[PDB]
Motif scaffolding. Structure first.
Motif, PDB file in Angstrom:
ATOM      1  N   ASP A  49       0.796  -1.219   0.000  1.00 57.76           N
ATOM      2  CA  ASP A  49       0.000   0.000   0.000  1.00 57.76           C
ATOM      3  C   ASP A  49       0.837   1.282   0.000  1.00 57.76           C
ATOM      4  OD1 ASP A  49      -2.623  -1.485   0.470  1.00 57.76           O
ATOM      5  OD2 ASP A  49      -1.442  -2.083   2.259  1.00 57.76           O
ATOM      6  N   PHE A  50       0.508   2.200  -0.921  1.00 56.62           N
ATOM      7  CA  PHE A  50       1.134   3.505  -1.097  1.00 56.62           C
ATOM      8  C   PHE A  50       0.214   4.380  -1.957  1.00 56.62           C
ATOM      9  CE2 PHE A  50       5.203   0.899  -0.940  1.00 56.62           C
ATOM     10  CZ  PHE A  50       5.734   1.466   0.230  1.00 56.62           C
ATOM     11  N   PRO A  51      -0.258   5.548  -1.479  1.00 57.25           N
ATOM     12  CA  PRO A  51      -1.088   6.454  -2.269  1.00 57.25           C
ATOM     13  C   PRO A  51      -0.304   7.026  -3.462  1.00 57.25           C
ATOM     14  CG  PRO A  51      -1.266   7.008   0.078  1.00 57.25           C
ATOM     15  CD  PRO A  51      -0.074   6.081  -0.141  1.00 57.25           C
ATOM     16  N   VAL A  52      -0.837   8.082  -4.091  1.00 52.36           N
ATOM     17  CA  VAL A  52      -0.238   8.774  -5.228  1.00 52.36           C
ATOM     18  C   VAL A  52      -0.442   7.956  -6.507  1.00 52.36           C
ATOM     19  CG1 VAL A  52       1.794  10.080  -6.078  1.00 52.36           C
ATOM     20  CG2 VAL A  52       1.274  10.058  -3.660  1.00 52.36           C
ATOM     21  N   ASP A  53       0.576   7.223  -6.985  1.00 55.56           N
ATOM     22  CA  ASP A  53       0.468   6.432  -8.207  1.00 55.56           C
ATOM     23  C   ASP A  53       1.648   5.470  -8.362  1.00 55.56           C
ATOM     24  OD1 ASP A  53      -0.700   5.807 -10.878  1.00 55.56           O
ATOM     25  OD2 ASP A  53       1.186   6.754 -11.578  1.00 55.56           O
ATOM     26  N   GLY A  54       2.851   6.022  -8.572  1.00 57.75           N
ATOM     27  CA  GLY A  54       4.090   5.285  -8.773  1.00 57.75           C
ATOM     28  C   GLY A  54       4.583   5.489 -10.214  1.00 57.75           C
ATOM     29  N   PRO A  55       5.637   4.774 -10.653  1.00 58.40           N
ATOM     30  CA  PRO A  55       6.418   3.812  -9.890  1.00 58.40           C
ATOM     31  C   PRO A  55       7.142   4.475  -8.718  1.00 58.40           C
ATOM     32  CG  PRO A  55       7.559   4.276 -11.951  1.00 58.40           C
ATOM     33  CD  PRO A  55       6.161   4.887 -12.004  1.00 58.40           C
ATOM     34  N   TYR A  56       7.596   3.644  -7.776  1.00 57.34           N
ATOM     35  CA  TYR A  56       8.284   4.071  -6.569  1.00 57.34           C
ATOM     36  C   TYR A  56       9.756   3.672  -6.598  1.00 57.34           C
ATOM     37  CZ  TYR A  56       3.276   4.174  -5.285  1.00 57.34           C
ATOM     38  OH  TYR A  56       1.930   4.387  -5.269  1.00 57.34           O
ATOM     39  N   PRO A  72      19.862  -7.619   5.235  1.00 57.70           N
ATOM     40  CA  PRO A  72      18.983  -7.214   6.325  1.00 57.70           C
ATOM     41  C   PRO A  72      18.959  -5.696   6.526  1.00 57.70           C
ATOM     42  CG  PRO A  72      21.052  -7.931   7.276  1.00 57.70           C
ATOM     43  CD  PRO A  72      21.091  -8.186   5.769  1.00 57.70           C
ATOM     44  N   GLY A  73      17.945  -5.233   7.265  1.00 62.92           N
ATOM     45  CA  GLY A  73      17.725  -3.835   7.591  1.00 62.92           C
ATOM     46  C   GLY A  73      16.367  -3.687   8.274  1.00 62.92           C
ATOM     47  N   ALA A  74      15.315  -4.119   7.565  1.00 55.95           N
ATOM     48  CA  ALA A  74      13.907  -4.135   7.929  1.00 55.95           C
ATOM     49  C   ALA A  74      13.302  -2.798   7.550  1.00 55.95           C
ATOM     50  CB  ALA A  74      13.652  -4.476   9.410  1.00 55.95           C
ATOM     51  N   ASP A  75      13.737  -1.756   8.258  1.00 56.56           N
ATOM     52  CA  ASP A  75      13.288  -0.375   8.134  1.00 56.56           C
ATOM     53  C   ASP A  75      13.746   0.291   6.834  1.00 56.56           C
ATOM     54  OD1 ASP A  75      16.012   0.942   9.243  1.00 56.56           O
ATOM     55  OD2 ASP A  75      15.393  -0.683  10.628  1.00 56.56           O
ATOM     56  N   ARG A  76      12.762   0.724   6.033  1.00 58.16           N
ATOM     57  CA  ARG A  76      12.955   1.363   4.742  1.00 58.16           C
ATOM     58  C   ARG A  76      11.967   2.494   4.504  1.00 58.16           C
ATOM     59  NH1 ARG A  76      13.644  -3.868   0.929  1.00 58.16           N
ATOM     60  NH2 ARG A  76      15.544  -4.633   1.999  1.00 58.16           N
ATOM     61  N   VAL A  77      12.422   3.514   3.765  1.00 58.79           N
ATOM     62  CA  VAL A  77      11.619   4.655   3.356  1.00 58.79           C
ATOM     63  C   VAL A  77      11.511   4.490   1.846  1.00 58.79           C
ATOM     64  CG1 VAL A  77      12.296   6.197   5.245  1.00 58.79           C
ATOM     65  CG2 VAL A  77      13.534   6.354   3.079  1.00 58.79           C
ATOM     66  N   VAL A  78      10.354   4.850   1.287  1.00 58.01           N
ATOM     67  CA  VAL A  78      10.092   4.683  -0.132  1.00 58.01           C
ATOM     68  C   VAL A  78       9.331   5.901  -0.690  1.00 58.01           C
ATOM     69  CG1 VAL A  78       9.023   3.005  -1.726  1.00 58.01           C
ATOM     70  CG2 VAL A  78      10.217   2.167   0.345  1.00 58.01           C
ATOM     71  N   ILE A  79       9.874   6.490  -1.769  1.00 58.07           N
ATOM     72  CA  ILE A  79       9.375   7.675  -2.470  1.00 58.07           C
ATOM     73  C   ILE A  79       8.739   7.299  -3.811  1.00 58.07           C
ATOM     74  CG2 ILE A  79      10.168  10.139  -2.615  1.00 58.07           C
ATOM     75  CD1 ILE A  79      12.909   9.411  -2.228  1.00 58.07           C
ATOM     76  N   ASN A  80       8.144   8.299  -4.472  1.00 57.29           N
ATOM     77  CA  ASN A  80       7.513   8.229  -5.786  1.00 57.29           C
ATOM     78  C   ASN A  80       8.596   8.643  -6.785  1.00 57.29           C
ATOM     79  OD1 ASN A  80       4.689   8.919  -4.143  1.00 57.29           O
ATOM     80  ND2 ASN A  80       4.368   7.758  -6.045  1.00 57.29           N
ATOM     81  N   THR A  81       8.355   8.455  -8.091  1.00 53.15           N
ATOM     82  CA  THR A  81       9.328   8.782  -9.127  1.00 53.15           C
ATOM     83  C   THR A  81       9.511  10.252  -9.491  1.00 53.15           C
ATOM     84  OG1 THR A  81      10.331   8.010 -11.189  1.00 53.15           O
ATOM     85  CG2 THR A  81       7.927   7.947 -11.055  1.00 53.15           C
ATOM     86  N   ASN A  82       9.771  11.060  -8.466  1.00 48.03           N
ATOM     87  CA  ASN A  82      10.044  12.466  -8.583  1.00 48.03           C
ATOM     88  C   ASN A  82      10.755  12.817  -7.283  1.00 48.03           C
ATOM     89  OD1 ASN A  82      10.058  15.253  -9.152  1.00 48.03           O
ATOM     90  ND2 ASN A  82       7.966  15.523  -8.372  1.00 48.03           N
ATOM     91  N   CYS A  83       9.946  13.059  -6.252  1.00 52.54           N
ATOM     92  CA  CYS A  83      10.372  13.439  -4.907  1.00 52.54           C
ATOM     93  C   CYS A  83       9.292  13.254  -3.825  1.00 52.54           C
ATOM     94  CB  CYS A  83      10.840  14.908  -4.929  1.00 52.54           C
ATOM     95  SG  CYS A  83      12.372  15.293  -4.031  1.00 52.54           S
ATOM     96  N   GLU A  84       8.077  12.783  -4.161  1.00 55.66           N
ATOM     97  CA  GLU A  84       6.980  12.661  -3.198  1.00 55.66           C
ATOM     98  C   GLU A  84       7.063  11.412  -2.322  1.00 55.66           C
ATOM     99  OE1 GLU A  84       4.025  11.228  -1.964  1.00 55.66           O
ATOM    100  OE2 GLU A  84       4.269  13.043  -0.704  1.00 55.66           O
ATOM    101  N   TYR A  85       7.341  11.602  -1.024  1.00 58.03           N
ATOM    102  CA  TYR A  85       7.440  10.524  -0.053  1.00 58.03           C
ATOM    103  C   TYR A  85       6.106   9.768   0.019  1.00 58.03           C
ATOM    104  CZ  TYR A  85       8.235   8.164   4.476  1.00 58.03           C
ATOM    105  OH  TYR A  85       8.320   7.255   5.481  1.00 58.03           O
ATOM    106  N   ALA A  86       6.097   8.510  -0.448  1.00 64.48           N
ATOM    107  CA  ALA A  86       4.919   7.653  -0.500  1.00 64.48           C
ATOM    108  C   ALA A  86       4.616   7.044   0.865  1.00 64.48           C
ATOM    109  CB  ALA A  86       5.144   6.579  -1.561  1.00 64.48           C
TER     110      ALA A  86
END
Length: 106
Positions: A49-56, A72-86
């Motif tokens: 699940d992620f609003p906006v549209d994508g790709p991410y 390993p890591g677990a914790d990740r941040v994921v953005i949209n294909t510009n700069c919008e934090y998804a």
């Protein structure tokens, strides 16, 4: 969003914005400036699940620093294909598999 919390592992609006402004300017600028597959395009298989549209684009975070351990890591941040934090995702209570959402995500 700004001041995102991945279960127990909290992240300041500074942490969110640091790692985000990073892949935003390193994912598809004119380089990679990552390990290999981080930053990279968001897979497809088991689309979370992620609003906006994508790709991410993914970026595995840490408790004070960008460009760290990716699986390993677990914790990740994921953005949209510009700069919008998804939104952020994390293996916080996954048993090394089942990913859960961060900051109001599920």
């Amino acid at each position: 969003q700004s001041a995102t919390t991945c279960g127990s592992t909290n992240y300041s609006a500074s942490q969110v914005r640091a790692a985000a402004n990073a892949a935003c300017q390193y994912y598809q600028n004119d380089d990679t400036a990552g390990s290999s597959t981080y930053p990279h395009t968001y897979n497809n298989y088991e689309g979370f699940d992620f609003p906006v549209d994508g790709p991410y684009q993914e970026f595995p975070i840490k408790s004070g620093g960008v460009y760290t351990g990716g699986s390993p890591g677990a914790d990740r941040v994921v953005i949209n294909t510009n700069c919008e934090y998804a939104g952020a995702i994390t293996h916080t209570g996954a048993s090394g598999n089942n990913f859960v959402g961060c900051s109001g995500t599920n």
